[PDB]
Design a protein around this ligand. Structure first.
Ligand SMILES: CCc1cc(N2CCCCCC2)n2ncc(-c3ccc(F)cc3)c2n1
Ligand SMILES: CCc1cc(N2CCCCCC2)n2ncc(-c3ccc(F)cc3)c2n1
Lengths: 237, 237
């Protein structure tokens, strides 16, 4: 419905967050193994990155889910390395900054050292930020912020009366990131699932039935079109 | 589409939260003054309370919004008193517990003393809880929880390593309430608008274009039907 051209003439949210869901359901629909769903979603991460960056998006936060059989768990823990293997050279050429939020202690040393090198390899780029949220949880992030504030208060380098909304935001894992103007959730679930609770206080939400491996350029455009037409509504605010 | 009978044979969320929006837009549609929108929404609070309580709902959290002309601001600040005036005797007979969350210091003394008496007048009831959220904000609630935890840590009655997800929940304004299984937002906006950020981490969300003064029994049923059919879906989880 919405061509690319139409979308560009309109407003482009600086920070988009996508809850990438439905990789396994896609595989089942396809009569394919579950791991083939996750691999296909990996290629969709690339196309989304490219288009969002072409579109002038400034931050793209992609959320990958967390008790499946431990062959599948190990496989997903190796996806970052495969993705970075195949797509990092064009990520540095396309001027992307690779970044990661979440509990990093949940991944093996080898996976972290691959991730951390792609990070420092793109840190001197200044284009789009590609933020991967891994083993990330909204409530845990909030509680960890409170505990670190409590510890500075305990040590006497922070006074409780100086703890305010903006200071609290500096203690979250997204401290140097503007809040997402747009959150997209694929695979038909209409929930937040413990994702960026504090940060999406005022974000527009766009839900779609489309499964993440199917969520290609046209579907991405339609969500932007949905975002834009909300800005063109009349009446009260 | 969904009769009452159908809805009852299914599962009833124990805690529902509604973002009551669209009172003014309804008035404009009706060629009526804005304050007549707010008064009509007040009568919809009653019918929703009655039906939810008949339906066996255990907690009903209703959210009323917060810079309009100061004739309209003063008018909304007097709605609690009018509502409690007209509907409290049947709220005590219908076994409802009236409760309130939010920054109470934002209302005048007379409005608080009316609210607080309706509270203690129903405190010895044990049926449905009717929770009114007034001058309530998700982020401020979270920050106030951190500041009180910081203060017990400062005084030495709490150790930082004992601050966890469940303890953090005890410091929110909804401390003695289960998280809502269902959040409903009327008037067509698909956003949270800084409402119960921590508490809706896992809630099902139901959005509707219906304006709150129009949101009567049938529309309420359809949202429950929507809630129930999500539980009957197949595939992955
Ligand atoms: C669970 C682990 C996982 C799963 C996963 N999926 C499954 C989630 C939906 C996308 C399909 C591929 N992806 N896709 C990219 C990454 C990635 C992570 C870190 C990084 F630095 C670069 C890329 C990824 N990581
Ligand atoms: C802003 C103040 C306001 C506005 C308002 N609206 C406007 C919001 C949508 C509902 C229409 C009537 N309502 N409806 C009930 C109450 C109420 C508050 C406290 C209490 F103890 C009992 C009832 C209410 N309070």
């Amino acid at each position: 419905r919405y061509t690319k051209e139409d979308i560009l003439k309109g407003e482009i949210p600086e920070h988009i967050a996508i809850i990438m869901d439905g990789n396994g359901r896609w595989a089942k629909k396809r009569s394919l193994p579950r791991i083939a769903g996750h691999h296909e979603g990996m290629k969709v991460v690339k196309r989304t990155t490219k288009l969002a960056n072409e579109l002038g998006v400034k931050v793209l936060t992609l959320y990958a889910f967390s008790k499946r059989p431990k062959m599948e768990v190990d496989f997903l823990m190796k996806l970052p390395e495969e993705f970075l293997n195949t797509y990092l050279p064009e990520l540095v050429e396309e001027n992307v900054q690779v970044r990661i939020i979440g509990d990093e202690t949940a991944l093996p040393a080898h996976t972290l050292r691959a991730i951390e090198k792609a990070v420092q390899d793109t840190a001197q780029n200044d284009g789009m930020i590609l933020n991967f949220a891994l083993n990330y949880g909204g409530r845990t992030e909030i509680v960890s912020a409170a505990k670190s504030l409590a510890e500075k208060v305990k040590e006497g380098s922070l006074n409780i009366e100086d703890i305010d909304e903006s200071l609290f935001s500096t203690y979250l894992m997204t401290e140097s990131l503007q809040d997402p103007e747009l959150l997209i959730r694929t695979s038909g679930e209409i929930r937040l699932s413990n994702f960026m609770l504090w940060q999406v206080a005022y974000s527009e939400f766009v839900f779609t039935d489309v499964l993440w491996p199917d969520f290609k350029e046209d579907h991405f455009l339609q969500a932007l079109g949905e975002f834009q037409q909300r800005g063109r509504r009349f009446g009260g605010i």
